[PDB]
Curated annotation (Swiss-Prot), chains B, C, D:
Changing R325A: Abolishes the catalytic activity. The gene is glfA. NADH binds at H66, R89, S91, Y417, R445, N455. The UDP-galactopyranose mutase appears to be an appealing adjunct therapeutic target in combination with other drugs against A.fumigatus. Galactofuranose is absent in humans yet is an essential component of bacterial and fungal cell walls and a cell surface virulence factor in protozoan parasites. Thus, inhibition of galactofuranose biosynthesis is a valid strategy for developing new antimicrobials. This is UDP-galactopyranose mutase. Disruption phenotype: Exhibits a marked growth defect, reduced cell wall thickness, and leads to the absence of short beta-1,5-linked galactofuranose in the galactomannan and glycoproteins of this mutant. Strongly diminishes conidiationa and increases susceptibility to drugs such as voriconazole and nikkomycin Z. Displays attenuated virulence in a murine model of invasive aspergillosis. Keywords: Cell wall biogenesis/degradation, FAD, Flavoprotein, Isomerase, NAD, NADP, Nucleotide-binding.
Amino acid sequence: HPDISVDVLVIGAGPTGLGAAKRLNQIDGPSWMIVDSNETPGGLASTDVTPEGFLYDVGGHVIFSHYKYFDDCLDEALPKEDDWYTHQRISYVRCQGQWVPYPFQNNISMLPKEEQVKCIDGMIDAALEARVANTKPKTFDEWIVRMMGTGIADLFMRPYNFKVWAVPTTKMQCAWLGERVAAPNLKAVTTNVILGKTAGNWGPNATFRFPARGGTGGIWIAVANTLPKEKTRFGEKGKVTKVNANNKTVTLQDGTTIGYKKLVSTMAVDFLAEAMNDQELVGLTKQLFYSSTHVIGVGVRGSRPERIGDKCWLYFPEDNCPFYRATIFSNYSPYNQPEASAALPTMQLADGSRPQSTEAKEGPYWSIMLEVSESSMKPVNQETILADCIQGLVNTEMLKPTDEIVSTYHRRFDHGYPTPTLEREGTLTQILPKLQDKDIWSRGRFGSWRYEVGNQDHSFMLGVEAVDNIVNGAVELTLNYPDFVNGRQNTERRLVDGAQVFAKS
Amino acid sequence: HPDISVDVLVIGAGPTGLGAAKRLNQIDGPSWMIVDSNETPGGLASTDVTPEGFLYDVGGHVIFSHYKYFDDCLDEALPKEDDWYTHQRISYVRCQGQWVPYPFQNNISMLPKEEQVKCIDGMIDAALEARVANTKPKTFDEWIVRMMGTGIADLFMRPYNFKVWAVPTTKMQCAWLGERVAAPNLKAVTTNVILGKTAGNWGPNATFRFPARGGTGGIWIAVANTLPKEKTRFGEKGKVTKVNANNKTVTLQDGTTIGYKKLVSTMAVDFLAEAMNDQELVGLTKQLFYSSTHVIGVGVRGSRPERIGDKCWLYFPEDNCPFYRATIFSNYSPYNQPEASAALPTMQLADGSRPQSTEAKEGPYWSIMLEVSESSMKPVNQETILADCIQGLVNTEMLKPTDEIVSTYHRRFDHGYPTPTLEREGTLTQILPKLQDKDIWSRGRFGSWRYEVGNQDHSFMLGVEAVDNIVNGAVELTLNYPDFVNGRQNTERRLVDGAQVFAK
Amino acid sequence: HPDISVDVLVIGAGPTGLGAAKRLNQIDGPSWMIVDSNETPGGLASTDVTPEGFLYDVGGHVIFSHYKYFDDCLDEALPKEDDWYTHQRISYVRCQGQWVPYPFQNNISMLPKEEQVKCIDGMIDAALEARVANTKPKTFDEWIVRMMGTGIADLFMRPYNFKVWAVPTTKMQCAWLGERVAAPNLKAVTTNVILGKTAGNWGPNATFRFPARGGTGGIWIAVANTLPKEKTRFGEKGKVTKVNANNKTVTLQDGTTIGYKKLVSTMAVDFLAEAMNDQELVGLTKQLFYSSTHVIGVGVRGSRPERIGDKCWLYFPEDNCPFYRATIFSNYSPYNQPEASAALPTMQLADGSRPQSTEAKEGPYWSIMLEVSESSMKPVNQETILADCIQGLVNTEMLKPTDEIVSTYHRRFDHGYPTPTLEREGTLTQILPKLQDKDIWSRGRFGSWRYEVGNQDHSFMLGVEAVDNIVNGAVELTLNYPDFVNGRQNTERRLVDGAQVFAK
Amino acid sequence: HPDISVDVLVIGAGPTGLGAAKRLNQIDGPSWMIVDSNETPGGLASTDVTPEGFLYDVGGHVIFSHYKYFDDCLDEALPKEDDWYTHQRISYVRCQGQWVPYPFQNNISMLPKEEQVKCIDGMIDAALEARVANTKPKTFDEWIVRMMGTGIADLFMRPYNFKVWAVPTTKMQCAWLGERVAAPNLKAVTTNVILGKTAGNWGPNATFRFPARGGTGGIWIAVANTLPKEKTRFGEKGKVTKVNANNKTVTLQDGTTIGYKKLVSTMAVDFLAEAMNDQELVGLTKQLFYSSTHVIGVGVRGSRPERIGDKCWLYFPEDNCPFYRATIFSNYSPYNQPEASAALPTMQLADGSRPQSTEAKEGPYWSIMLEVSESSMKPVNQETILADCIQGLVNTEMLKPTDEIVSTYHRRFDHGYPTPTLEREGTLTQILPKLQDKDIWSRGRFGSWRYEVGNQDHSFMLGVEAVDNIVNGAVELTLNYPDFVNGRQNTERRLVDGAQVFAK
C-alpha cells in the first residue's frame, strides 16, 4: 500500500495542472491532489525578477481568453479592478528601418514603391491561383505563400517564422493555423497601398488585460491560493521521479509514493516517458521536435522614448538582431520595474561602453523583454547572446547607443515551443492513445504538445476538460478540436455550474 | 407553493425527454420529474398494432447511433441478444420498372443506355462547374444539381424530395446536409456505368438492429422502465396544459401544479408557446414550417415474395404511387405480424376487389409500411389515401392484383417532419434564445425543430445534453453543431461515468 | 448598245474607289473608268475651308498605314519631304478636370485616390473572372467590362462609346475589336498607380504624317491626279442614278449609259440598293445601322495656349460637352489656318457674347475641330449644336470665356460611321454575296459597312483587293479578315510589282 | 553571258515546282523554264512499279484539297470521270487485336472494360484541367495529353507518333497542329462508350479521289504534260549541280548555265545550301531534322480478304510490327496491280516458307503498301526490314501465314519527313530570309520544310503562290499561315482568272 491514495492525481501546477485542480475542487467529488517540483506554481507562465527590481515573464505573455470558465477563475483570483491594467493589442513588424503596423500586408505602403510593386505583383499571382485552387496547402510554407504571395511572404512570415520555430517553414504542417482558406485579401492590400494608408488590427475593443503586480506569474499564484492547501504539494517535496503506470503509483523525490485511479500529467510528455521507464514511449517521444527559448530582459533608464510609445509587442524577421520578438514590458504595468525614485547605477550603455559615473541615480525606468529561439538546427551561443541582443536593440533603433542600461536578465528554457512539424500528428497519435489506455491524461503545452492550443487559456482548459472527461464524460474539445474551441465563445462551462447550485439547497 | 416542486422538470417522454430523464437519473443530483400526456412513453418512436396483430412504427424507423451513451441505454433496456435482430442496411429506389440499389447514381447502369448518356452528360456539366465554383449552394435544389447534375437530379432526388418534404427543393436550405462540398464523384459514377455494375451501400458492416418485440416502441417502454416510477407521471394525469414561465410553474390537465427551477420541454415548440400564452412566441413559432405524415400499414397473406426478398426500405420518386417510402416491416422481426398458425379472413384483394372466400385462413403473413407526406403546399385526400396507397403497391409491383390483404392501418401524425426551409434558422435563433433566457430548454424533433439531428439517437442526446448543460456546464453539441456530432464517434459520455464510479 | 463600255466600272472616288483605280491603272489590262458625283475626289476623306481660311477635315483624320501599297501611292502622290509634317500620336481623355494620357487605364494615377481604389477593385474583379472565363464576350459592353472592370468602364469607355456610336454599348458586337482575349492587364495598371506614373502610348516611333497643304483632302486630289483623266468622270456628269444589275448597265445623271463586265461600287450600299431598284436589297440594307457626323470647326485668335500644347486628339466621355472628340487641327499643319499677318475681325467670344468692334486684327491663329454623332437613338439640334459645342469648349477648359473666335464651321455628314451592331454581320451575309453573284463588288466604309476596316488605308486597300480579286484571283483579305490584315505589316503588294518590271 | 536566260527559273518538277510552272504558264507574262534531275516529273508524289506489275506510291498518298486552283489543274490534267476513282476516307488503328475505327478516342468501346475505365478517368482529368488552363501546350506531347488524357495518349498518339517521326513527342513543337484548343471532347467519348458504339470519321461526304491509272505519279505526269515542252528540261540534262546566288546563275550537270532574275527552288533546302557553296547556310540547314522513309510493297494472291475489306489506311502504334502505316493500295484502283488473268508464281508464303509449287498461277491480286521511318534516333536494318515488315503483317493479322506473296517492293527515301522539332522555326526564320534576300524563293516539303503545309495540294500551292508573289505581289499565305489556308476554302485563285478572260 502506497504512502497516500487519491482518485485523481495531478502532476504539475502550471496553468494546465491548475485548471485540473480548479475543476476538481469545484466538482468536489473524487479525492484529488496536485504536485509540483517548484515551490511556486505557474510553470512557464511564471515571472522572474532581477536583483535590480525588473520583472520578466517567460517571453511576451498576452492573454486572449476563448473561455468564460477561464475568465471566472482569473476574476476569482484577482477580483479588484485595480488588480489589472487594460491595453490595446498594439504590435508592429520591424522592416527596412520602419515600424510596420500588424498585420504586415495591410501596411506595406510604408515600404519603397518599387518593393510595393513586387509585393502586389506577387499577391496578384496568389489571388489568381487561389481562384482556381482545388487542394489544401500541405506545408506552413505553402500556406504562407498562398495567403501572401512570394514578395510579401519573403519580407515577413518566411524569415520571421524560421527565427521563431528554428526550423524551416517547409518542414512544418499548416493544419494548426485553422480552417481559413489560404488566399490573399488582394483588395484590402491594394486599397491600403493606393490610399498610402496604415492601419493596425487594434482599437478600443481589441484589448488585453495584464496583472498589475507580479507579472503573469501573479495570476497563477493567486489562482493556486484558492485551492485547499492540504491538497497541494509544491517544492522539492512535490518533485515526481518515477511513474509506475502498471501499478498506478507515482514516486516523489523524497520517497513518498502516491496511488491514483486516474493521472493528469502536465509535465513534458518526453519527461513522462522517462519517468515511466517505458522504452517504447521514450522512443516515440524523442520523435517530437521542440525548440528552447532564451528570454533576455533589459532595464533602461529614462522615461519611455517617443519612438517606443504605446508599442506592446514587436516582430523581427530581419537578421540584424537575434531575437524574433520584443515586448515593451514596462508598458504592461508600472509595477514591472522599479518606481522613479528608486536609485540604480548604470551598468553599461547600449553600445557596450562604460558609464561616465558609477553612481546610483534615479529613474524613471523602462524595460524590454526579448525572445531568442534555439534548436538543433539553430544554435545559440549562450556566452554572447545577451550582448548580441543588446546590439540588436541598437541595430533596430529600439535603443540609442547612449541609452543607459540598469539591469539585465537572461534565462534559457529547455522546452520552450513544441514544434508543429510535418511529423507531429503522426507521432502524437501513437503516444496519446498508449497513455490513455493506462488511464493517463497527458495534457498541456508539452503535456499534449499542441502549440495551437498552447496558450494560458487553452492549457488551463486542457486541464479542466481532462477532469471533466474523467468525471463527467465531457468531450475533450480543446485537445482534439482546436478550430472548434477557437472559433467560438465557450460560455457553457462556469466556475459555478448548476450542480453546485442545486447542491447548495 | 405549488403541489409539487422539483429542480428540473421534463415535459415529454419520447426519446428526447427520456434522454433528459436518464441523464438526470444517472447524475442523481438535482431532483426531477418527467411528465407525458400518453400512458405509453415513446412519442413518434412508438408502435401501434392493428386488431389483426400487425405492428407498425410511425413510418420507417431505423437506428443508426452516433453515441455510446445511447447504445448504453439501449443495452441496459434490452440486454439480451434475443432482444434484437440484426439486418443489413438494404435499400433501393423504384425507377422505371426497376429496383435500383441505393445510392442511385452508382447504379444507373440499370437504366436504358440513352438515359445513361443524359445522366452522365449532366454530371459532366456539374463536374466542370464544380471545378471553378467558389460559392456554396444556397438552396437544397442547388445542392442537388451540383452533386448529381440535372439528369440524375430529375430522376431521383428532386421528385423524391418533393414527395418527402411536401415543399419544393428550391424552398429549402442545404446546410442541414453537412459541410461536404456539393460536387459529383464523376469517376465513380462513370466507372460503374462503364463496368456495367450495380452496388448498394450495404454489407456485413453496414447493419442495423431492430427490437425483437414491440417494434421500435418497445425500446422506449423498456428504457422508461429503468426510471424510478415515482418520478414519472404519464397519461391524462401528466398532460401539460399551462406553462407560466414567469413563475416557473406548470399546470397539468387535472389541475396539479409543478414548480421547477429549470424546464426541459420536448413537446412541439409551437405547442409550448401556446401553453405559455406567450403571444410573441406564438407568432414566431407560426413562422416555422412542418409536414404531416400519413402512416399506412398493409398486412398480406403469404410467404415473403422473392421479388421483395431481403429489401428493408424503398424510395419512390415516381408518380405512380403517393408514398415516398415503403418498409418491408415483416423483415425487421418475425414478431411484427401474426404467426403462420393465426387464422384471419381476407379483407380485400390488392386490386381492390372482394375476396372469393370470407373464411378465416392461416398465414404465413408479411407486411408493408408506407409513408405519405402532407402540407399546406401538398394536400392529401384523407378519404382515399389508403386505397391510393394500395393501388400504388400494385403499380410498383410490390403486390400482385391477386394478393390477399388481411389487415390495414392508417394514422395521420400532424407533426411529422420539421422542414429545413430557407427561413428555419432565422426563426429558431429568435425562439430558442428567448426560451433559454426564461430557463426553458426546448429540445427534440419539434422541441428544437432540426431534422438533421431529429432521429432517435439525436433526440435522446438532445435531452441528455440539455441536462448535462443544466448541471455540468456541458456544450449542447448535438443542438448547435449537427455536423460535429454526426461526423465522429461520440464515445466520451457513458451511462456510468467516473462520477458514479468514484461515488462508490 | 450603251454609250460607253468598259471591263470594270468603279463607282465613287473616295479612298476605296481611288484604290481600285490605282490598281487598275497599275495592272493596265482590262479597260476601266471611274465616276463620282463630286468634282473633287476624296469622299469623306476630303477637306473644306471656311471663308476665313480655316481648313477642316471631315472630323479627326489620322493615318496609320497597315500596307506598303498604300504608302507607295501616297509617296507617289506627294513625293516631296515638305509635302508632309510628322507628329507623335498624342491623345488624352478629358476626365474630372484632368487631361489623362491615353490609354486611360494606365494613367488613372491622375485621378483622386478614392477613384483609383474603385478602378482597381473593379479591375481585380475582372481579373478573377477572366481567370475562369471560358466564353467570349458577346457584346461591346461585355468586352469593355471584361477588359477594364466596372469602375474604369464607367469613367471612360462606356460613356465615351455611347457618345461616339450613338447607340448603347450593349447593342454592339465586339468581334470588330479583334482577337485579343478580353482580360485586364491588372499588373500594368496597379504598377502605374503604385509608382504614381503616367505614360502615353506615343513616342519617337509612334508617329503619323499629315499633308502640308490642303488637309487630308490634298492626298486624294493628288492621288487622283496620277490617273489618266480620260478614264475619269467627276462631277454632275458622273453622278450615278441607276444601276441595272441584270443588264450590267449603269445610267448617269446626264443620261449617259455605261456597260460593265465587273462593277466596283463604293457608294453606300443602301444607296446602291435604291439605285438598283431592288426591293429585296433595299429591305436588307435598311436593316443596317449608321450614325451621322456633325463636324464643327472653331478658329481662334492667339498663339497656341500652353494648356493645349502638342495635343493632337482628345476624347470626352463626360456629359459637359456634346462632342466625343476634339482635334487641335492647327497642330497638324501651319497651313490649316491663316498666317499670323492675316487680319480677321472677332466673330464672337467663347462665352457667346459678340463684341461691338468689327476691327480686323492680326493673328496668329489656332484651330479646334470637333465631332458630334447623331442617329435615330440620339438626336441633334442642328440649330444649336455650334453654340453648344463652343460652350463645351469652355466647360472643358479648351477655351477661356474671353477667347476670340474668328471663324466657325459646321457640316452634317449623313453617312458618318457604319455601326458594328449585333445584327450587322447577319445582314451583311445576306447582302454582300447577293451582290457578288451579280458581279458587283460593293466595298468601302459604307460600300461594305465594316468600321474595323473603315480607315483610309483599309478603304484604299478594299478597292485595290477588289480589283486584284477580279483580275488576279487574289484573296480579299481586308474585307473578310480585318484581324489578319491589321495584325501584320502588309508588304507583299506594291505600286510596282514583278509584273510591271518584267513587262519592260 | 549564260547559255540560257529567263525571268523565273524553277528548280524541281515535283508538285511544288509544277505549281510554280502552272501559274507561270497561265500568267504568260515573264519568261520561264523548269528543270529537274529526273526524266519523270512528280518528286515524292511519283509512282513505282515492280517487275511483277504492282504499283506503289511513295507511301500512302491521299489527296485532300484545300484549294480550287489545285482542283482546276487536276481536273484539266485528268478531265474524264473515268480517269478517277472515288473512295470514302476509311482508316483504323490496330490496337490489342482490334481494328479500332479512327478517330481512336471515339471507339474505345472495342477495348476491354477495365481499360475503358482507365481511358475515361484520364480524359476526365484532362477535361477538368482544360477547364482552368491558362497556357498553351509547348510540346507535341503536352498537346496530346491535353486532348486525350494519359491513358488514351499512351495507347495511340504517343507510341504511334514516335514510330512516325522517329523522335519523341516531347521533342516536337505543337503549333503545326493548328489553333484548335487542346482539350478533350469528353462527352463525345463517354457517349460512344456508354452506347457501345463505334463510328469512323467517314461517310459519303468524306471521300477522296484516286487516279485510275499510273498511281499518284500519274497526276503529275499529266499536269506536266500541259506545259509547253520547250520550257521544260527534265533528266540528266536538268540536274542542277551549282547555284551562284551572287551572279544569279544556275549550272547543270552537262555544264549548261541558266541566268534568272528570280529563283524558285523546290529541292531540299539543305542540298540547295550545298549547291550554293554557302557555308553559313550549310551550317544552318544542317540544324534541320528530318526522317528517312522506307516504303515496302507486298503483292498477294487472292480476292481481297473479308478481314481487310474496304479499309484504306491503317495506323500501328504497337511494337509487334516495324511500320507505322499500311495502305490497302489495291483498294485505290484496280490498275494498281495485275488483272486477275495475269499469271505470276508465288515467291513465298507470309510466314516465310517456300510455296509448294513454283509455277505461275492466276490472280486476282491484292496489295499492301507499308511505311517505316528511320532517323539517327531510330535506325533501320535495310537488309532485314522487308522480312520484318512481312512478319509484322502476320503479327497484325493482315496476312495469314498461308497467304501467297507474288511481289515485293522496297525503297528508301533519304528525305522523307521534315520534322516539326522544337527548334525547326528558330532555324527556318534564319534560313529563309537570307535566301529571300538573294531573290531565292525556297519552297516545298523540303524546300520550305514545314510538314503542316507539306501535302500535294499545299506543295503545289507553295509554288503557285511563290510565282504569284513574284509577279503579282500576292501574300504567301500557305507558306506563312498554314492555319489560315487550312481553315478556309480557297476559291479565289483559278486556273482561268479575270486577267486571262479580259485578254481574249
